[PDB]
Design a protein around this motif. Structure first.
Motif, mmCIF file in Angstrom:
data_model
loop_
_atom_site.group_PDB
_atom_site.id
_atom_site.type_symbol
_atom_site.label_atom_id
_atom_site.label_comp_id
_atom_site.label_asym_id
_atom_site.label_seq_id
_atom_site.Cartn_x
_atom_site.Cartn_y
_atom_site.Cartn_z
ATOM 1 N N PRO A 7 9.334 2.430 -3.527
ATOM 2 C CA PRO A 7 9.928 3.667 -4.058
ATOM 3 C C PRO A 7 8.948 4.606 -4.732
ATOM 4 C CG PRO A 7 11.270 1.826 -4.646
ATOM 5 C CD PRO A 7 9.995 1.275 -4.176
ATOM 6 N N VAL A 8 7.863 4.095 -5.311
ATOM 7 C CA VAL A 8 6.887 4.982 -5.933
ATOM 8 C C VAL A 8 6.151 5.783 -4.868
ATOM 9 C CG1 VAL A 8 4.860 5.040 -7.429
ATOM 10 C CG2 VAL A 8 6.734 3.493 -7.916
ATOM 11 N N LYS A 9 5.879 5.159 -3.719
ATOM 12 C CA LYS A 9 5.323 5.896 -2.589
ATOM 13 C C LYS A 9 6.328 6.899 -2.039
ATOM 14 C CE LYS A 9 2.188 2.196 -1.148
ATOM 15 N NZ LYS A 9 1.794 1.279 -0.048
ATOM 16 N N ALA A 10 7.611 6.517 -2.014
ATOM 17 C CA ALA A 10 8.660 7.414 -1.535
ATOM 18 C C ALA A 10 8.797 8.642 -2.427
ATOM 19 C CB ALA A 10 9.988 6.665 -1.454
ATOM 20 N N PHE A 11 8.592 8.474 -3.728
ATOM 21 C CA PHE A 11 8.644 9.600 -4.652
ATOM 22 C C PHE A 11 7.391 10.463 -4.552
ATOM 23 C CE2 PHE A 11 7.986 11.404 -8.905
ATOM 24 C CZ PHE A 11 9.155 12.124 -9.019
ATOM 25 N N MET A 12 6.224 9.823 -4.531
ATOM 26 C CA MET A 12 4.980 10.567 -4.609
ATOM 27 C C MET A 12 4.644 11.275 -3.301
ATOM 28 S SD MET A 12 2.816 11.569 -6.676
ATOM 29 C CE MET A 12 3.280 10.595 -8.096
ATOM 30 N N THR A 23 6.280 20.916 -10.743
ATOM 31 C CA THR A 23 5.325 20.082 -11.456
ATOM 32 C C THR A 23 6.034 18.991 -12.248
ATOM 33 O OG1 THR A 23 5.311 21.557 -13.363
ATOM 34 C CG2 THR A 23 3.650 21.949 -11.663
ATOM 35 N N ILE A 24 5.267 17.963 -12.604
ATOM 36 C CA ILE A 24 5.761 16.848 -13.416
ATOM 37 C C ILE A 24 4.711 16.477 -14.448
ATOM 38 C CG2 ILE A 24 7.392 15.803 -11.786
ATOM 39 C CD1 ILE A 24 5.112 13.931 -10.932
ATOM 40 N N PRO A 25 5.148 15.988 -15.608
ATOM 41 C CA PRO A 25 4.191 15.537 -16.622
ATOM 42 C C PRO A 25 3.563 14.203 -16.254
ATOM 43 C CG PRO A 25 6.407 15.165 -17.384
ATOM 44 C CD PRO A 25 6.527 15.964 -16.127
ATOM 45 N N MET A 26 2.470 13.882 -16.948
ATOM 46 C CA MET A 26 1.671 12.704 -16.638
ATOM 47 C C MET A 26 1.290 11.958 -17.903
ATOM 48 S SD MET A 26 -0.726 14.122 -13.601
ATOM 49 C CE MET A 26 0.238 14.778 -12.272
ATOM 50 N N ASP A 27 0.520 10.886 -17.707
ATOM 51 C CA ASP A 27 0.024 10.109 -18.835
ATOM 52 C C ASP A 27 -1.372 10.550 -19.263
ATOM 53 O OD1 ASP A 27 -1.148 9.182 -16.507
ATOM 54 O OD2 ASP A 27 -0.867 7.057 -16.960
ATOM 55 N N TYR A 31 -5.986 12.058 -13.405
ATOM 56 C CA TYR A 31 -5.339 12.222 -12.114
ATOM 57 C C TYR A 31 -4.448 13.457 -12.075
ATOM 58 C CZ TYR A 31 -6.971 7.542 -11.145
ATOM 59 O OH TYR A 31 -7.765 6.438 -10.937
ATOM 60 N N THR A 32 -4.206 13.932 -10.858
ATOM 61 C CA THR A 32 -3.490 15.162 -10.566
ATOM 62 C C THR A 32 -2.355 14.826 -9.599
ATOM 63 O OG1 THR A 32 -5.651 16.206 -10.798
ATOM 64 C CG2 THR A 32 -3.924 17.625 -9.985
ATOM 65 N N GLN A 33 -1.359 15.719 -9.524
ATOM 66 C CA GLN A 33 -0.155 15.492 -8.727
ATOM 67 C C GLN A 33 -0.464 15.381 -7.245
ATOM 68 O OE1 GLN A 33 2.732 18.517 -9.463
ATOM 69 N NE2 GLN A 33 4.318 17.612 -8.165
ATOM 70 N N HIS A 44 0.358 -0.970 -11.687
ATOM 71 C CA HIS A 44 -0.200 -0.235 -12.816
ATOM 72 C C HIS A 44 -0.330 1.253 -12.533
ATOM 73 C CE1 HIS A 44 -3.847 -0.915 -10.418
ATOM 74 N NE2 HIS A 44 -4.310 0.180 -10.993
ATOM 75 N N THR A 45 -0.164 1.674 -11.283
ATOM 76 C CA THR A 45 -0.196 3.078 -10.914
ATOM 77 C C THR A 45 1.193 3.698 -10.850
ATOM 78 O OG1 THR A 45 -0.176 2.534 -8.563
ATOM 79 C CG2 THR A 45 -2.315 2.718 -9.639
ATOM 80 N N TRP A 46 2.158 3.156 -11.592
ATOM 81 C CA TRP A 46 3.437 3.846 -11.486
ATOM 82 C C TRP A 46 3.551 4.912 -12.569
ATOM 83 C CZ3 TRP A 46 7.668 -0.463 -10.598
ATOM 84 C CH2 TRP A 46 7.400 -1.089 -9.379
ATOM 85 N N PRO A 47 4.065 6.091 -12.236
ATOM 86 C CA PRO A 47 4.162 7.153 -13.239
ATOM 87 C C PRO A 47 5.344 6.975 -14.181
ATOM 88 C CG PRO A 47 4.838 7.965 -11.106
ATOM 89 C CD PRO A 47 4.305 6.592 -10.875
ATOM 90 N N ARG A 48 5.069 7.254 -15.458
ATOM 91 C CA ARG A 48 6.066 7.124 -16.511
ATOM 92 C C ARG A 48 7.190 8.139 -16.345
ATOM 93 N NH1 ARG A 48 3.514 8.162 -22.184
ATOM 94 N NH2 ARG A 48 3.771 10.305 -21.407
#
Lengths: 49, 49
Positions: A7-12, A23-27, A31-33, A44-48
């Motif tokens: 699902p993280v690949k499906a979102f990204m 746009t979306i916020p990050m940690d 890294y960039t969108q 460990h690469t999942w966005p908050r």
């Protein structure tokens, strides 16, 4: 597929196509969108957001 | 045979890593030995997209 992060690949994939329009916020500031959805293969690469 | 060189063999009280550098060269000590490898950066980090 039986990978632990589908699902993280499906979102990204949509976020990669969507950058420049929404746009979306990050940690962090490293890294960039427009970071490719191939690279998000470990939890460990999942966005908050 | 110079006992003052072979300190590690002739002195049971001496620790294994014990050298005296200006006076003698001791001719026999513990040395470490590695097995590291140095592959190319293009082969260790990919960047496949």
């Amino acid at each position: 597929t039986t990978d632990p992060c589908a699902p993280v690949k499906a979102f990204m994939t949509l976020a990669n196509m969507m950058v420049g329009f929404e746009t979306i916020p990050m940690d962090n500031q490293i890294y960039t969108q427009s970071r490719r959805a191939s690279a998000f293969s470990t939890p460990h690469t999942w966005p908050r957001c | 045979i110079p006992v003052e060189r072979y300190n590690i063999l002739t002195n049971p009280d001496a620790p294994p890593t014990q050298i005296q550098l200006p006076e003698v060269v001791d001719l026999y000590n513990v040395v470490t030995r590695y097995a590291y490898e140095t592959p190319p950066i293009t082969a260790v980090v990919m960047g496949v997209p």
